[PDB]
């Protein structure tokens, strides 16, 4: 009744009074409208069925021949566990019907299979092989553990989890040192840094830059307000430190004490708004030809809308109204085309609304893949109340996994003052819709706060004393009441399906490096070996570049699995949580190349003998295949993304044989093919052509599949420019993908070019 308001403030890292203190009507209009939208989404959520509620809380973790395996099935009420044998091609209902007959001695449509000690469920018309939990148990050799949960238990859980030419007067400034004005409609100008007042578009930006050559500060603002009315008159521009930047935020600097301010005046012409859609509908040499053929583009080339929207004159109101008439009648564009329109080059709200309309067909799995890029588009946005915010919030309240990651993508960027207001207001609105999930994320917030204090304890002690004494100091600090309660019994921020319960204090350690990252181990009695999970807590380094690289490798694996090619990739979870704060998922039963190299007689034998120890007898044959597929997959991945600084310490190998990279610090500027890995692929033989030429084929096929989806990597990386990455800021960064994948060249021309690069790495081996 009263605690909710106080709980949001602690959770989002900013007090609710701070929004009210600004006295801005736009912020107040957002808080009132979004709350009603979020509460209506929460009202429909309670009206949903028991299976529909499972689709929200526990989304199906699905995979992107008459095998049989035993399954341990138990009930909610009793501790009785009935183990029986089933088939991999069987439906979950068949497993439920078989479990029903076991309890009869000692209807299945009323049950749902819950994964023991996990926030995951098995349901729907899909064979057992299509589930992520089943396939993971098969390679580990473990038997799946499921619990029968009746419809009444899911329904009871739902009830407990409920809620004239344009001119401006340049007055004065106040800066520190020893003013260029320009009008923009996206990435390009409207006039020279010479435009009529009636010839001004709705999404027009007035950009400023203060300099002496030495750049000092910049400031951008919208000509029209949130209520479609042109701004008048006097305005104070709180400048941001630094030629002219149109991509930057249209909101002033919050530090009104130290940052520079510029006073400007907007001359009154009448209370002139912008004409509504109803009124709009009535009204080198290649660019002119494309605009001439505009009707043929709407009828024959719908995909060419992006090229048509760049050629249209935004500085003339006649061309804008003519284009908008076609846009309202324009057919629905596919996912790939809609992602291109979200870029800063297309600022118009109607273009943005058309993109959202085309993005409505996205599945919860597809939305999760591009979620990071969609959150970045919010930075490019002009106003708080927009279609992208409504779409991201509406889908976050429809799927709890989406709502989990959306929150963390907004919470991690709260320390940045340019996005602190927007991201905080979106999180506040989401909390009004999901009251129970707000409490769930609070437990994660308490755990990360304790981890920061534990990392600070380690950072100080490691300098004062040695490594074994600092480890025991960390152990004694963890054993405390406050630490044992906050760090136990919570949903993992890296994966909401994974439950972190008991923390194994003795297994917990730290790396003796510059930032001192924490190693946190867990265990669950209900889950068993599935509950044995680890988390790496890092503080001081920016993990935004590490996550993006790991998300692209995850995307590569998804695109390869779509064409029936499983290159056994290891896409472990990486997620930033705050100011240089983040988490890394531990890939258990794996070690670095350096640790294994340090019995074997030679360096080439070190990796092979380790595989012979973990996979004995005929199990070694699978480990070589697992290594060959993973090496070929990561070889293309490290070449396309351009991952440099590669040594034995940043390359890891699983006990099953799977090879994977870690520590992605530098990207986008050949691929390493050292004989140490080649020796494993060739089964230990000095000369094995039949085993090497197969590996050569896997590298060539993986490269061609990514070339076909070449535009997808180009569209997503262009949207990530808003984040402000140090290695992904200029047009030269996106050019690396155009050079590595060779988009301009044909399928055969790029494959022949790839063969030269493949032989270059083999000659250096
Ligand atoms: C070796 N070591 C590392 C190195 C390190 N390990 C990483 N992981 C990736 C997931 O499987 C486990 C290893 C990812 C990464 O970026 N850096 N971090 C540590 C943190 C605490 C203790 C030891 C640590």
Topology:
Layout (H helix, E strand, L loop, with lengths): L2 H10 L4 H5 L3 H22 L3 H8 L10 E8 L5 E7 L4 H14 L5 E5 L5 E2 L9 H9 L4 E6 H10 L8 E6 L5 E5 L20 E7 L3 E8 L11 E5 L1 E2 L19 E5 L11 H4 L5 H7 L1 H7 L4 H7 L5 H12 L6 H7 L7 H11 L4 H17 L6 H10 L3 H12 L8 H14 L1 H30 L2 H12 L2 H6 L3 E2 L7 E2 L1 E2 L5 E2 L7 E6 L10 E6 L4 H19 L11 E5 L2 E5 L4 E3 H5 L5 H12 L5 H21 L10 E4 L4 E3 L13 H7 L7 H20 L1 H10 L11 H10 L6 H18 L1
This protein binds ligand VWN.
The ligand Cn1c(Cc2nc(N3CCOCC3)cc(=O)[nH]2)nc2ccccc21 binds next to β16 and β17.
InterPro entries: ARM-type_fold, C2_domain_sf, Kinase-like_dom_sf, PI3/4_kinase_cat_dom, PI3/4_kinase_cat_sf, PI3/4_kinase_CS, PI3K-type_C2_dom, PI3K_ABD
Subcellular location: Cytoplasm
GO biological process, one term: defense response to fungus
Helix content: 40-55%
| CA(first)-CA(last) distance | 68 Å
Count of extended strands: 23
Briefly, what CATH class of the largest domain?
Mainly Alpha
Which ligands, by name, code or SMILES, are bound? the ligand Cn1c(Cc2nc(N3CCOCC3)cc(=O)[nH]2)nc2ccccc21
Q: What's the number of structural domains?
A: 5
Under CATH, the topology of the largest domain is which? Phosphatidylinositol 3-kinase Catalytic Subunit, Chain A, Domain 5
CATH architecture field of the largest domain: Orthogonal Bundle
Provide the gyration radius in Å.
29 Å
- State the helix count: 30
CATH superfamily of the largest domain: Phosphatidylinositol 3-/4-kinase, catalytic domain
**Shape, principal axes of CA atoms:** globular
Oligomeric state, counting identical vs distinct chains: monomer
PDB class: transferase
Keywords: transferase, P110D
Assembly: monomeric
Entry title: Discovery and Optimization of New Benzimidazole- and Benzoxazole-Pyrimidone Selective PI3KBeta Inhibitors for the Treatment of Phosphatase and TENsin homologue (PTEN)-Deficient Cancers
């Amino acid at each position: 009744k009263k605690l909710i308001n106080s709980q949001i403030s602690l959770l989002i890292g900013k007090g609710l009074h701070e929004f009210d203190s600004l006295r801005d009507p736009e912020v107040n209009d957002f808080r009132t409208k979004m709350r009603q939208f979020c509460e209506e989404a929460a009202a429909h959520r309670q009206q949903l069925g028991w299976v529909e509620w499972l689709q929200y809380s526990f989304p199906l973790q699905l995979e992107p021949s008459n095998r049989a395996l035993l399954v341990n099935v138990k009930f909610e009420g009793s501790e009785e566990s009935f183990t029986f044998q089933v088939s991999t091609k069987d439906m979950p209902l068949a497993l439920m019907a078989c479990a029903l007959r076991k309890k009869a001695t000692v209807q299945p449509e009323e049950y749902a299979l819950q994964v023991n000690g996990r926030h995951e469920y098995l349901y729907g018309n899909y064979p057992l092989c299509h589930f992520q939990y089943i396939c993971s148990c098969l390679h580990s050799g473990l038997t799946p553990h499921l619990t029968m949960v009746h419809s009444s238990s899911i329904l009871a859980m739902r009830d407990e989890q409920s809620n004239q030419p344009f001119s401006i007067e340049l007055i004065e400034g106040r800066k520190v040192n020893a003013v260029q004005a320009g009008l923009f409609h996206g990435n390009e100008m409207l006039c020279k840094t010479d435009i009529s007042v009636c010839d001004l578009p709705r999404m027009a930006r007035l950009c400023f830059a203060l300099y002496a050559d030495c750049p000092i500060a910049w400031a951008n603002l919208m000509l029209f307000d949130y209520k479609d009315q042109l701004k008048t008159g006097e305005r104070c521009l709180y400048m941001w430190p630094s030629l002219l930047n149109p991509a930057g935020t249209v909101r002033g600097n919050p530090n009104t004490e130290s940052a520079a301010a510029l006073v400007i005046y907007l001359p009154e012409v009448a209370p002139v708004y912008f004409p509504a859609l109803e009124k709009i509908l009535e009204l080198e040499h290649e660019k002119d030809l494309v605009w001439k053929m505009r009707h043929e583009v709407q009828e024959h080339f719908p995909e060419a809308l992006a090229r048509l929207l760049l050629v249209t004159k935004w500085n003339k109101h006649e061309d804008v109204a003519q284009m908008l008439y076609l846009l309202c009648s324009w057919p629905e564009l596919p996912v790939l085309s809609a992602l291109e329109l979200l870029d800063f080059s297309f600022p118009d709200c109607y273009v943005g609304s058309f993109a959202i309309k085309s993005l409505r067909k996205l599945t919860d799995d597809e939305l999760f893949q591009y979620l990071l890029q969609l959150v970045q588009v919010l930075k490019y946005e002009s106003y708080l109340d927009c279609e992208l915010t409504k779409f991201l919030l509406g889908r976050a309240l429809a799927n709890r996994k989406i709502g989990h990651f959306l929150f963390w993508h907004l919470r991690s960027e709260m320390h940045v003052p340019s996005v602190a207001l927007r991201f905080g207001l979106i999180m506040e609105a989401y909390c009004r819709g999901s009251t129970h999930h707000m409490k769930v994320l609070m437990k994660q917030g308490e755990a990360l706060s304790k981890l920061k204090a534990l990392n600070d304890f380690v950072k100080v002690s490691s300098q004062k004393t040695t490594k074994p004494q600092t480890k025991e100091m960390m152990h004694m600090c963890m054993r405390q009441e406050t630490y044992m309660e906050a760090l136990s019994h919570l949903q993992s921020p890296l994966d909401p399906s994974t439950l972190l319960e008991e923390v194994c204090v003795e297994q917990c350690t730290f790396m003796d490096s510059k930032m001192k990252p924490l190693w946190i181990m867990y265990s669950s009695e209900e889950a068993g070996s599935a509950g044995n999970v680890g988390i790496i807590f890092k503080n001081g380094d920016d993990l935004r570049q590490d996550m993006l690289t790991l998300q692209m490798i995850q995307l590569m694996d998804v695109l390869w699995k779509q064409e029936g090619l499983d290159l056994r990739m290891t896409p472990y979870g990486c997620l930033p949580t705050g100011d240089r704060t983040g988490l890394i998922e531990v890939v258990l039963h794996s070690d670095t190349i350096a640790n294994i190299q340090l019995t074997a007689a030679f360096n080439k034998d070190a990796l092979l003998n380790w595989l012979k120890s973990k996979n004995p007898g005929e199990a070694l044959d699978r480990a070589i295949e697992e290594f060959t597929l993973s090496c070929a997959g990561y070889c293309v991945a490290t070449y396309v993304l351009g991952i440099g600084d590669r040594h034995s310490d940043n390359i890891m190998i699983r006990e099953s044989g799977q090879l994977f990279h870690i520590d992605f610090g530098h990207f986008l500027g050949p691929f390493i093919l050292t004989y140490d890995f080649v020796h494993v692929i060739q089964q230990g033989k000095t000369n094995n052509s039949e085993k090497f030429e197969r590996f050569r084929g896997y590298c060539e096929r993986a490269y061609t599949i990514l070339r076909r989806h070449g535009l997808l990597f180009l569209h997503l990386f262009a949207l990530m420019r808003a984040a402000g990455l140090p290695e992904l800021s200029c047009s030269k960064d996106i050019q690396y993908l155009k050079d590595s994948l060779a988009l301009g060249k044909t399928e055969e021309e790029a494959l022949k070019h790839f063969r030269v690069k493949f032989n270059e790495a083999l000659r250096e081996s």
